[PDB]
Amino acid sequence: FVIRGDEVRQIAPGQTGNIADYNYKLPDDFTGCVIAWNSNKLDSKVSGN
Amino acid sequence: ALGKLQDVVNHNAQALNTLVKQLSSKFGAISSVLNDIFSRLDPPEAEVQ
């Protein structure tokens, strides 16, 4: 998916916030990896996406 | 005269009291209240505590 810049830290087990509660919840006993990279060049419109 | 009989009771009660007192020690954690540890801190180091 695509999220805001400061919300990338909300994608973690045990976190609290708007994204971690109403959009995507990670289990406490989570295993695996998360990969997040800036994509300002492909998901940005001057008029507004 | 009955110190021999009294000492058994005095030892048992004192040991039980010592166990109850040891129940309320922080043991190196930030707090000795368990639900406080749950609520105040996130799971990552709450698990360690």
mmCIF file of all heavy atoms in Angstrom, chain A residues 14-15 28, chain B residues 42-44:
data_model
loop_
_atom_site.group_PDB
_atom_site.id
_atom_site.type_symbol
_atom_site.label_atom_id
_atom_site.label_comp_id
_atom_site.label_asym_id
_atom_site.label_seq_id
_atom_site.Cartn_x
_atom_site.Cartn_y
_atom_site.Cartn_z
ATOM 1 N N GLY A 14 2.379 -3.545 18.063
ATOM 2 C CA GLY A 14 2.145 -2.836 19.300
ATOM 3 C C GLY A 14 2.021 -1.333 19.181
ATOM 4 O O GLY A 14 1.869 -0.662 20.208
ATOM 5 N N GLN A 15 2.078 -0.781 17.974
ATOM 6 C CA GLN A 15 1.962 0.658 17.812
ATOM 7 C C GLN A 15 0.504 1.095 17.892
ATOM 8 O O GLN A 15 -0.426 0.293 17.772
ATOM 9 C CB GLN A 15 2.570 1.106 16.484
ATOM 10 C CG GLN A 15 4.079 1.016 16.451
ATOM 11 C CD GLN A 15 4.729 1.859 17.523
ATOM 12 O OE1 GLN A 15 5.278 1.336 18.492
ATOM 13 N NE2 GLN A 15 4.670 3.175 17.358
ATOM 14 N N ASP A 28 0.827 -8.752 17.425
ATOM 15 C CA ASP A 28 1.897 -8.540 18.395
ATOM 16 C C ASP A 28 3.053 -9.507 18.170
ATOM 17 O O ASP A 28 4.223 -9.113 18.233
ATOM 18 C CB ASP A 28 1.349 -8.677 19.814
ATOM 19 C CG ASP A 28 2.038 -7.753 20.795
ATOM 20 O OD1 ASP A 28 3.275 -7.614 20.715
ATOM 21 O OD2 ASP A 28 1.341 -7.163 21.647
ATOM 22 N N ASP B 42 4.872 0.039 25.576
ATOM 23 C CA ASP B 42 4.515 -0.801 24.447
ATOM 24 C C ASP B 42 5.028 -2.228 24.651
ATOM 25 O O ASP B 42 5.925 -2.464 25.463
ATOM 26 C CB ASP B 42 5.058 -0.196 23.151
ATOM 27 C CG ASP B 42 6.568 -0.066 23.146
ATOM 28 O OD1 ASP B 42 7.206 -0.397 24.162
ATOM 29 O OD2 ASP B 42 7.120 0.370 22.115
ATOM 30 N N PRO B 43 4.466 -3.195 23.926
ATOM 31 C CA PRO B 43 4.817 -4.612 24.141
ATOM 32 C C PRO B 43 6.308 -4.906 24.034
ATOM 33 O O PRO B 43 6.805 -5.742 24.804
ATOM 34 C CB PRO B 43 4.028 -5.333 23.040
ATOM 35 C CG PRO B 43 2.828 -4.484 22.854
ATOM 36 C CD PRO B 43 3.276 -3.060 23.064
ATOM 37 N N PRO B 44 7.071 -4.275 23.082
ATOM 38 C CA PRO B 44 8.489 -4.650 22.921
ATOM 39 C C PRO B 44 9.296 -4.840 24.201
ATOM 40 O O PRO B 44 9.851 -5.922 24.411
ATOM 41 C CB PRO B 44 9.049 -3.492 22.091
ATOM 42 C CG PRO B 44 7.931 -3.146 21.201
ATOM 43 C CD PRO B 44 6.663 -3.357 21.997
#
